[PDB]
């Protein structure tokens, strides 16, 4: 055990607090509890709950004071672009022991990796934008905009879009997004058409002043939501998804060279000798199957320029798109070697499992979740913090 940074857990444009959905976890799903297992192995781990359809801007917001404490500061500048409030939730911060000189290893599934990444962007080196506006405007500034943090040993992405997804590219993707939230849901055995007094699925839409009222069921409130500033604006998930949104993320989200990084690609799917599609497995999950597999195995465009490597998929992400940013990025990749590097993607390997297979929200006997996220957990209690050249 070379270092004892403890983990810390991000879920994608779906997830939950530990106290949300009955206690269906997130991380484990059907499988049991990811955060317990590790924590019971000796591995010091903590869950992280954001908003699932808020951009990565917003959600490494809500993550920075989730984790350090205090009341969300979404910069005054992206606040006054946007529409939406500069101040959002207060929170009494998971590891105060941040700011008085530790590290953490992110580890993220789906959407994650690219708050993960942003997150790590923002403490290294902060907002240019954020601090000018604040100079200009005489408004004061969060210090997650001043840059200098080094808070973030390591980001693991599992599964993640970091080229985006061509999923967003569906004629009736904006249905088939919530069908899937309402898929999610059903896998917690939580009715969508129920009008549950208690918030069980809460999308922390505090800065565009969206929550679900007395009476209103997740169906209804998905319809209004459809038609809310989370779900047509740039300051959104949506929008961080697609393919040129994932690109202009790429942009600027670089990778530091004071943090390891590690990438995990998943895949559910078979290639068809006459097409050169792709199609779902047997054991997919049944709603990535019969929905979302066979336009993501078969969808081409050549202006947007997607050719068939991005085919191959787990049902909701390319993974062509996995194994880091490539779309408009710099960041290196490289195949694992047997030794892990600091400022470059370790590409650790593609596995057979779909989107919500690898965090059990989906079952798969044949897939060990236990040991894939022990071993997972000793590789990063395996980082060295220094390192010094030999033969
Ligand atoms: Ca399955
Ligand atoms: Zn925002």
């Known amino acids: 055990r070379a270092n004892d940074a403890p983990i810390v857990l991000l879920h994608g444009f ?7 959905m009955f206690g269906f976890k997130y991380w484990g799903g059907v499988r049991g509890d990811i955060e317990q297992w590790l924590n019971d192995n000796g591995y010091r781990t903590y869950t992280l709950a954001v908003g699932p359809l808020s951009s990565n801007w917003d959600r490494a ?30 929170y009494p911060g998971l590891l105060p022991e941040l700011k008085r000189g530790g590290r953490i290893h992110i580890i ?15 403490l290294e080196n902060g907002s240019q934008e954020e601090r000018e506006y604040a100079k200009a405007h005489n408004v004061s500034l969060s210090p997650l905009f ?41 896998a917690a055995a939580v009715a969508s058409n129920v009008p549950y007094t208690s918030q069980v699925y809460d999308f922390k839409l505090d800065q565009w002043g969206l929550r679900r009222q007395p009476g209103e069921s997740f169906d209804q409130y998905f319809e209004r939501l459809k038609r809310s500033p989370v779900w047509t604006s740039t300051d959104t998930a949506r929008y961080d998804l697609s393919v040129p949104g994932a ?17 995990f690609t998943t895949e559910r799917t078979y290639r068809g000798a006459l097409t050169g599609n792709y199609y779902p497995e047997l054991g997919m999950n049944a709603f990535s199957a019969v929905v979302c597999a066979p ?58 499992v779909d989107h919500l297979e690898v965090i059990g929200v989906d079952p798969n006997p044949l897939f060990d979740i236990r040991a894939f996220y022990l071993r997972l957990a000793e590789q990063l209690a395996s980082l060295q913090p220094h390192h010094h050249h030999h033969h």
């Open 247 to 263: 690109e202009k993320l790429n942009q600027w989200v670089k990778a530091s060279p004071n943090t390891y990084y590690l990438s």
């Open 61 to 90: 917001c809500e993550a920075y004071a989730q984790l350090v404490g205090g009341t969300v500061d979404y910069g005054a500048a992206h606040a006054a672009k946007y529409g939406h409030a500069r101040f959002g939730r207060t």
């Open 295 to 352: 336009f993501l195995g078969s969808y081409r465009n050549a202006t947007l320029g997607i050719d068939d490597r991005w085919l191959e998929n787990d049902g909701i992400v390319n993974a062509f798109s996995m194994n880091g940013p490539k779309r408009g990025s710099t960041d290196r990749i490289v195949p694992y070697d047997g030794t892990i590097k600091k400022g470059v993607w370790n590409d650790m390997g593609t596995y057979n």
């Open 108 to 122: 993220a599934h789906s959407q994650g990796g690219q708050t993960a990444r942003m997150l790590v962007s923002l």
């Open 146 to 186: 001043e840059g200098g943090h080094h808070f973030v040993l390591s980001v693991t992405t599992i599964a993640t879009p970091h080229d985006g997804t061509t999923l967003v590219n569906m004629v009736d993707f904006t249905d088939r997004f919530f069908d899937l939230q309402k898929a999610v849901l059903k």
């Open 14 to 20: 779906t997830g939950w607090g530990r106290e949300e």
